[PDB]
Amino acid sequence: SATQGQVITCKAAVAWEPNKPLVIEDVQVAPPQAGEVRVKVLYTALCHTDAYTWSGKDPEGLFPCVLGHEAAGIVESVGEGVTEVQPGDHVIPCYQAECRECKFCKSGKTNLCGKVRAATGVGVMMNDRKSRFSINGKPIYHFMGTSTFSQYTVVHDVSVAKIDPVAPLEKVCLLGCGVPTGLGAVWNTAKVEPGSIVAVFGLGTVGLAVAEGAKAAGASRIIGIDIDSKKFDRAKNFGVTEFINPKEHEQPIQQVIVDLTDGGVDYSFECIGNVSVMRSALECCHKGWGTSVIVGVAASGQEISTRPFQLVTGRVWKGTAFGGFKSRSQVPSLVDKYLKKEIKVDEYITHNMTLADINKAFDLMHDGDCLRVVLDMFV
């Protein structure tokens, strides 16, 4: 092509400083080296994680950087040795890599591959330990090995999920984080059986995907917990059957749940990232078999606590990262299901904006009322 083996100059939302507005810049995107894939990002969605690193609260946050991790697009070019994808292929860049060969990938116990982890965590590429982004010949850090707030991005081949070309890229971009995290918290991590009584803390995108997950798992009761009653009405469509606003109760929320569940829930899922709520999600679980899955990401230097009697008496404490899904092997399968009308994707999108409206999209996310905000990159 016209850009194959060449430096690309494109539009990118750059986070120059933490807690400052994002500026749409003109950026140089280097071609892909060995094991790398240059992707044309057509649509990108904002996740609370981008805002967290943006705020300045993330200790692993490196500035200046190109944020974003939830996106879909097309392969512009591939580096040396890239065989699974070719130019023109429809793809989903994934923050969680899948080499298929390491200790983690060679076991059916996890999805947490660590092939590219070190590089990605420091805003660079594995092959040369450098960024593929520059403004005035100076580097701009990558983020989560994705950096989807740039029209053109360079990602490792092991983090490129090849999807059905007939699938709509303005919807499927969500299948890169929030939605699979929720579905997978239920299907892969918890393995919720039919008839199960479920508690969901937080009715945001992930909490709503945990609700769809539980409904598909054949849960008899999906209890939704949120300190904002406005979030209840929209939750019903996602399978939530009962609701509790902790603010309307003087006793701890776990105690309220235990009274409505006859000893507690079979499975609880905390989708806020609040350590105090993580404790409450554990304690609301039924004695002997109750299982709490931490879905939400908590702030650095904050601990979860409980009395060990809670675990001795049969409760289980676990968590999920990208809902246990293997990016390359399983994200295309999630796209096939959506196309077969087996799973929901569209229903999580409330807003469609343009890349130039990035700060307006961030504004809507800080307020917390909305669901997903899909940005059209080429407008």
Nearer to a copy of itself by Cβ, of 81 and 195: the residue is 195
Is 113 annotated to bind ligand? yes
Q: Is 52 in the site for a copy of itself (CB under 8 A)?
A: no
Q: How far is CA 235 from CA 175, 203, 211, 330, in A?
A: 19, 7, 8, 26
Name the token pair of 202.
């937080």
Nearer to a copy of itself by Cβ, of 80 and 193: the residue is 193
| C-alpha to C-alpha distance for 280 and 230, rounded to whole angstroms | 22
Q: Is 121 in the site for a copy of itself (CB under 8 A)?
A: no
| C-alpha to C-alpha distance for 179 and 207, rounded to whole angstroms | 9
Catalogue the active-site residues.
47-49, 69-70, 99, 102, 105, 113, 117, 177, 372
Q: Please, what is the Cα angle at 278 between 273 and 281, to 5 degrees?
A: 125
For a copy of itself, what does the binding mask look like between residues 100 and 119, x meaning CB under 8 A? ---xx--x-xxxx-------
- Cis omega (within 30 of 0) for bond into 64: yes
Positions that interact with Zn ion (CB under 5 A): 47, 49, 99, 102, 105, 113, 115, 177
Q: Which of residues 245-264 bind a copy of itself (CB under 8 A)?
A: 262-263
Q: Which of residues 131-150 bind a copy of itself (CB under 8 A)?
A: none
Q: Is 195 in the site for a copy of itself (CB under 8 A)?
A: no
- CB 65 to Zn ion: min, Å: 15
Is 99 annotated to bind ligand? yes
For a copy of itself, what does the binding mask look like between residues 304 and 323, x meaning CB under 8 A? xxxxxxxxxxxxxxxxxx--
| C-alpha to C-alpha distance for 43 and 73, rounded to whole angstroms | 7
For a copy of itself, what does the binding mask look like between residues 74 and 103, x meaning CB under 8 A? -----------------------------x
Query: For 60, what's the count of Cα atoms within 13 Å in the CB-facing half-sphere?
Result: 18
Question: Considering only CA atoms, which of 144, 119, 138, 129 is closest in space to residue 53?
Answer: 144
| C-alpha to C-alpha distance for 196 and 266, rounded to whole angstroms | 6
CA dihedral 66, 71, 77, 80 (to 10 degrees): 80
Write the DSSP assignment of 157-181 as a string of letters. GGGEEE--TTS-HHHHGGGGTHHHH
Is 47 annotated to bind ligand? yes
| C-alpha to C-alpha distance for 324 and 187, rounded to whole angstroms | 9
Q: Which of residues 260-289 bind a copy of itself (CB under 8 A)?
A: 262-263, 275, 278, 287-289
Nearer to Zn ion by Cβ, of 41 and 47: the residue is 47
289 binds, among Zn ion, a copy of itself, none (CB under 5 to 8 A by kind): a copy of itself
Q: Is 24 in the site for a copy of itself (CB under 8 A)?
A: no
Q: State the residues that interact with a copy of itself by CB under 8 A.
A: 103-104, 107, 109-112, 262-263, 275, 278, 287-289, 294, 297-298, 301-321
